[PDB]
Design a protein around this ligand. Structure first.
Ligand SMILES: *C(=O)CCCC[C@@H]1SC[C@@H]2NC(=O)N[C@@H]21
Ligand SMILES: *C(=O)CCCC[C@@H]1SC[C@@H]2NC(=O)N[C@@H]21
Lengths: 594, 90, 182
C-alpha cells in the first residue's frame, strides 16, 4: 500500500500544494546537480582509525602534534541556517557521500547533526534524525563526525532531567557518533560541567567551546575583557576536556583580537589543540582567520565555495589559495574543491523558495550595532514573515538592540537570542518604544518565554539583569534559584514506551522513544501524518518541491528493484462534492486516484 | 458613475480601541489555546486568563485590571489577529 | 617595466588587477620591492574582490608600503566588485594606519545604495552568482567584463550555455598565448 500512499501524496501535492509554508514564491529550476565520479576502492584512512585504535587522548595528541592546519568543513549544518532556513532534504545529501569518503581524508571531522536539524526534521522535514545518522554512517567510514550539543538542556529549548541527557548522550554515541560538542547559552559553569561529564560518560572526545562577545581589543569594553575570558578558560580546562574551542556566531573577531586572544590562550596551554568557529558576516573573516592560523590556530572552520560568505563561513578556495607559499601548508588539492563547489552551486538553486539572499543581497556591514547571530538572522526573518512583520523586517531588527539593552549586554547564542528576538518582535508588533515599555512593564502582558527566562530556568547571567524590570514582570511568581536542573525532578521514559505502543506504536525503537520524550506533540504529528501519506524522504527533492505538472514520468525508488515509475496522465474536475480524480501510470499499471 | 456591483466585503473582526482600557486586545496574532474565564465571572490583577499559540510562539493573556467580565468575544479555537476585541473586564 | 616608466617621467604609479590575483605573499613582496628604490613616488593599487579574500591581500599591501587603496561601498561590494567599506574601516581601529573615517556615515551611505540597487532589477549578478566563486585562477576572466560578457552572450543567446562559454575562455587565452587582457 506504500506505492498507493505515495501516489496519493503526490496527487495531493499537485492539486493542493506543498504543505510546508513557502517563504518566497519561487519555482525550483530543473537543473540536476552533477554527481562527481568517485574511485571504486574503499575510502582512505583519516583519523577515525587512529581513535578506534586508541583512546580519546591518542586522538587528542594526534591532532596536537600534526604539522599543518586542520579543516572543519561546514557545508552540511552551518551553511543551512547561515543561508537557507535549515531547510534541506537528505535525499540529495547522499550524493557526495562516496566522494567525501573517498577523495576527502585530510578533513578533520564532519558536522553531521544539529539541534536545529533535529527540530526541523521533527517539525517540517518529514524525516527521522536517528535514521539520518544511521544511513550516513556506512557511506563514509573514513572521517569522524562532530555534533553540536549543549550542557544543561540537550536537544530542546528548556532544561531537561540529567538522566534524560545521559540516555540521549549514550544512545547517540552508541549509534556511531564520534565527537561531542557541548556549550551553554550563558557562562554558567555547572551546566558546562554537566555536559562535559555527560560527554565523558558516553565515552569519547570532549571538546569545549566558549562564546566570544564584544571587542576584546577595545580598551573601553570592560564587561568582557581578556581576563574574564582567561579565568573562564582556566575553569574549563580544570574541568577536564580534550580540545578547546571558541564560539563566534556574529563573527566579531578582528585580526588584532584574533592574534591577542590566540597568543594569550596558547601562552599557557601549548598542549590542547585549539578549535575556532566563526561566520563571515562582516566580510573580513578571511584575514582574521589567516591571522589566527599564523598565531596558533589548530582547527579552522571553513565553508564550501558556493555556500560561503554572506552570513556563512569563509570559502575553501580563498583559504587554500592564500596559504600556498607558507609553512602553514594546508596541503589540500583544489581541483576537487572546484567540482564540490560546482555540485553545491547546482544544488543550491533547488531550494530557491527560501533564500535569504533575496533579502540579504550584500555583505551587510553595520552588524556590530545589531550583533545579530549569523545562524538566527534568516530564522527571525521567516518568523516575522509568518507573523506578518516581513514587510517591516528592517524595523524588527531595529528593535533587537533596544531589547538587548533592556536585559543588558549578555552573550546570546541559541536560547539567548530567540528570547530577545521575541522581545524585538513584541516591540515592533505593539509598535512601542524601550523606555516606556520599561515603565509600563507590569500590566503589559509579555511573552511567556521571556517570563521563563526571568524566572532563571536557563540560568544566572554573568552580568545580571535589572531589578525593577524583573520585579515588575515576575511580580508574584515563584522563582527557581541556582541550577534548576539539580532541583529539577528527573522524568522517567519507560512509561513513554508503553504509552506509545498502546496509542500508535508497534515497532517503536528506543531512539524514537527518546525523540517522543523530547518533542512529543510534533512527534505524534510526524508519525500520524507519515502513517497516512506513506513513507516520505524517498523521492527526489526537486520532484516533490515543484511537482507542478502532468505527463511527467518520474521514478521513485522506495525500495531497490521497485522503480515505481509515475506518469501523471491527466487530471479530472469536480464530480459532486469537491473531490477530483487524477490519472496515474505506474511502471506498467494505470491507477485512478481520488 | 458610482458602481453598484462593488459588493463591499463584510469581515466582522471586532477591533479593540486603544482609548478604552477595559477592552482587551491580542498582543500577537495566532490561535487561542484555551480561555480561563467564562462570561460573568470575576478576574484579578496579574492573573492569566487566555493563552495564544503561533507557529513557534506562545503567549498567555494577563488581566489588565480588577472586576467582572461581561462577555467573551472569543469562544474557542479561532484565528485571532492582534489588538481585537476578545473580552471586557468590569 | 617600472624603471623604464620612472625614467620616462610620471607623477603616480598604479597596479591594476582585474581578477584579483594579488596573494598576500605576492602583495607584500611586490609592494616592498617597488617601495625599495622609490620611497618617494606615490603608489596606487586597484583590484577586484573576485576570489573572496581580497580584504586580506589589501590589508597586507597597506601594511607593507601601499599609499592609495580602491574600496567600494558595502552594498556594491563583494561578489565580483571591489572590497567593502565596512571591512577596511572596522579592521583599522587599533591600527597605526588609521583610516579614521566616521563609520556611522558610511553605514547610511551603504544603506542608500542597498535600497537603490533594487530599481535596476534587470541588471545584476543574479543566479549566475549566488555565492562568490573561486576558480577565477583557472578562468583568468576580468571582473570588469563578467556582467557585460553575460549580457552579450544572452544577447546572442548563449546565456543557457553561459557555463560552456566561460570554460572556453581559458583555451582561447592559451590559443593566443598567455597575454594580459584588460
Ligand atoms: C524553527 O523553525 C527552527 C528553529 C529556528 C531558529 C534557529 S535554531 C538555531 C539558530 N539559532 C537561533 O536563535 N535561531 C536559529
Ligand atoms: C558594450 O556592451 C559595452 C562595452 C563592453 C566593454 C566593457 S568595458 C568595461 C568592461 N570591461 C570589459 O572587458 N568589457 C566591458
Amino acid at each position: 500500500n506504500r506505492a498507493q500512499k505515495l501516489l496519493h501524496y503526490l496527487g495531493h501535492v499537485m492539486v493542493n500544494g506543498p504543505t510546508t509554508p513557502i517563504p518566497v514564491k519561487a519555482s525550483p529550476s530543473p537543473t540536476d546537480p552533477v554527481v562527481p565520479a568517485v574511485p571504486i576502492g574503499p575510502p582512505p584512512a583519516g583519523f577515525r582509525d587512529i581513535l578506534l585504535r586508541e583512546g580519546p587522548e591518542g586522538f587528542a595528541r594526534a591532532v596536537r602534534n600534526h604539522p599543518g592546519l586542520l579543516l572543519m568543513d561546514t557545508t552540511f549544518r552551518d551553511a543551512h541556517q547561515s543561508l537557507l532556513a535549515t531547510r534541506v532534504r537528505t535525499h540529495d545529501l547522499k550524493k557526495i557521500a562516496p566522494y567525501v569518503a573517498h577523495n576527502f581524508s585530510k578533513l578533520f571531522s564532519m558536522e553531521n547533526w544539529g539541534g536545529a536539524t533535529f527540530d526541523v526534521a521533527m517539525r517540517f522535514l518529514y524525516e527521522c534524525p536517528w535514521r539520518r545518522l544511521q544511513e550516513l554512517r556506512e557511506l563514509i567510514p573514513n572521517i569522524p563526525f562532530q555534533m553540536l550539543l549543549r550542557g544543561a538542556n540537550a536537544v530542546g529549548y528548556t532544561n531537561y532531567p540529567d538522566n534524560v541527557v545521559f540516555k540521549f548522550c549514550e544512545v547517540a554515541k552508541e549509534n556511531g557518533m564520534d565527537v561531542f560538542r557541548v556549550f551553554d547559552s550563558l557562562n554558567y559553569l555547572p551546566n558546562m560541567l554537566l555536559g562535559m561529564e555527560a560527554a565523558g560518560s558516553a565515552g569519547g572526545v570532549v571538546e569545549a567551546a566558549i562564546s566570544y562577545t564584544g571587542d576584546v581589543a577595545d580598551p573601553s569594553r570592560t564587561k568582557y575583557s581578556l581576563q574574564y575570558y582567561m579565568g573562564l578558560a582556566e575553569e574549563l580546562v580544570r574541568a577536564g576536556t580534550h580540545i578547546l574551542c571558541i564560539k563566534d556566531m556574529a563573527g566579531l573577531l578582528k585580526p588584532t583580537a584574533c592574534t591577542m586572544l590566540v597568543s594569550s590562550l596558547r601562552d599557557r596551554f601549548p598542549d590542547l589543540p585549539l578549535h575556532i568557529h566563526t561566520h563571515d558576516t562582516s566580510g573580513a573573516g578571511v584575514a582574521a582567520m589567516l591571522a589566527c592560523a599564523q598565531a596558533g590556530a589548530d582547527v579552522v572552520d571553513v565553508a564550501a565555495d558556493s555556500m560561503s560568505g554572506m552570513t556563512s563561513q569563509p570559502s575553501m578556495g580563498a583559504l587554500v589559495a592564500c596559504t600556498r607559499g607558507t609553512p602553514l601548508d594546508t596541503e589540500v588539492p583544489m581541483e576537487r574543491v572546484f567540482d564540490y563547489s560546482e555540485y553545491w552551486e547546482g544544488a543550491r538553486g533547488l531550494y530557491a523558495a527560501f533564500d535569504c539572499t533575496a533579502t540579504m543581497k550584500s555583505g551587510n556591514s553595520d552588524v556590530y550595532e545589531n550583533e545579530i547571530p549569523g545562524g538566527q538572522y534568516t530564522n527571525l526573518h521567516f518568523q516575522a514573515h509568518s507573523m506578518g512583520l516581513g514587510s517591516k523586517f528592517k524595523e524588527v531588527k531595529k528593535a533587537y538592540v533596544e531589547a538587548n539593552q533592556m536585559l543588558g549586554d549578555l552573550i546570546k547564542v541559541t536560547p539567548s537570542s530567540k528570547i530577545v528576538g521575541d522581545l524585538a518582535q513584541f516591540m515592533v508588533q505593539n509598535g512601542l518604544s524601550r523606555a516606556e515599555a520599561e515603565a509600563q512593564a507590569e500590566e503589559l502582558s509579555f511573552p511567556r518565554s521571556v517570563v521563563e527566562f526571568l524566572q532563571g530556568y536557563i540560568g544566572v547571567p554573568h552580568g545580571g539583569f535589572p531589578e525593577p524590570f524583573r520585579s515588575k514582570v515576575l511580580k508574584d511568581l515563584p522563582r527557581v534559584e541556582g541550577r534548576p536542573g539539580a532541583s529539577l525532578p528527573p522524568l522517567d521514559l519507560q512509561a513513554l514506551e508503553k504509552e506509545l505502543v498502546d496509542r500508535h506504536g508497534e515497532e517503536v525503537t528506543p531512539e524514537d522513544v527518546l525523540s517522543a520524550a523530547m518533542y512529543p506533540d510534533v512527534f505524534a504529528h510526524f508519525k500520524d501524518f507519515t502513517a497516512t501519506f506513506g513513507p516520505l524522504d524517498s523521492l527526489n527533492t526537486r520532484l516533490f518541491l515543484q511537482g507542478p505538472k502532468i505527463a511527467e514520468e518520474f521514478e521513485v525508488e522506495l525500495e531497490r528493484g521497485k522503480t515505481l515509475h509515475i506518469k501523471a496522465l491527466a487530471v479530472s474536475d469536480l464530480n459532486r462534492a469537491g473531490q477530483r480524480q487524477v490519472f496515474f501510470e505506474l511502471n506498467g499499471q494505470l491507477r485512478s486516484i481520488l | 458613475v458610482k458602481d453598484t456591483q462593488a459588493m463591499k466585503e463584510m469581515h466582522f473582526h471586532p477591533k479593540a480601541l486603544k482609548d478604552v482600557k477595559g477592552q482587551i486586545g491580542a498582543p500577537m496574532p495566532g490561535k487561542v489555546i484555551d480561555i480561563k474565564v467564562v462570561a460573568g465571572a470575576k478576574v484579578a490583577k496579574g492573573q492569566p486568563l487566555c493563552v495564544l499559540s503561533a507557529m513557534k510562539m506562545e503567549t498567555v493573556v494577563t488581566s489588565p485590571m480588577e472586576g467582572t467580565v461581561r462577555k467573551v468575544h472569543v469562544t474557542k479555537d479561532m484565528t485571532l489577529e492582534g489588538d481585537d476585541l476578545i473580552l471586557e473586564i468590569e
